[PDB]
Design a protein around this ligand. Sequence first.
Ligand SMILES: [Cl-]
Ligand SMILES: [Cl-]
Ligand SMILES: [Cl-]
Length: 162
Amino acid sequence: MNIFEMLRIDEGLRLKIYKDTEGYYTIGIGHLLTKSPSLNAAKSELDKAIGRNCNGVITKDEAEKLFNQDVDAAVRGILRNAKLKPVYDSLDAVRRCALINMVFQMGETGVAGFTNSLRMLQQKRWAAAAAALAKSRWYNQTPNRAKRVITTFRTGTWDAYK
Ligand SMILES: [Cl-]
Ligand SMILES: [Cl-]
Ligand SMILES: [Cl-]
């Protein structure tokens, strides 16, 4: 199991525009297009990203290209982040995937605000970290996903995805 497989399970693959779980226009494997309510903006956002006139529909290969860039963007953001780096450096390989998962989903800034959870993870207080993470809007909005990520952090294994 790896990060890509891990995220493909959590996000799915959709080749046509879509509203995410919060109104948002998205496509591919969790590629946020826009927070604006304009299909039009999303539609335009899609074209600028693919580089072509997509008319709100993309191909697998295209969705995969976008996914490759997003994961890279996620890892590099963590590594540039004064808040996230130390946490990341301190973790084993599995749990690191979990951190990447979260950043992909909510942005650097979003994850950076899980102060307490972050401190706990750095201290290797797994169980405590899992409880803090659970008390979030994230958990209540996308509970099943959230739980897969939290178990991953708690256990250090890929069980939740097996
Ligand atoms: Cl927290
Ligand atoms: Cl809460
Ligand atoms: Cl979910």
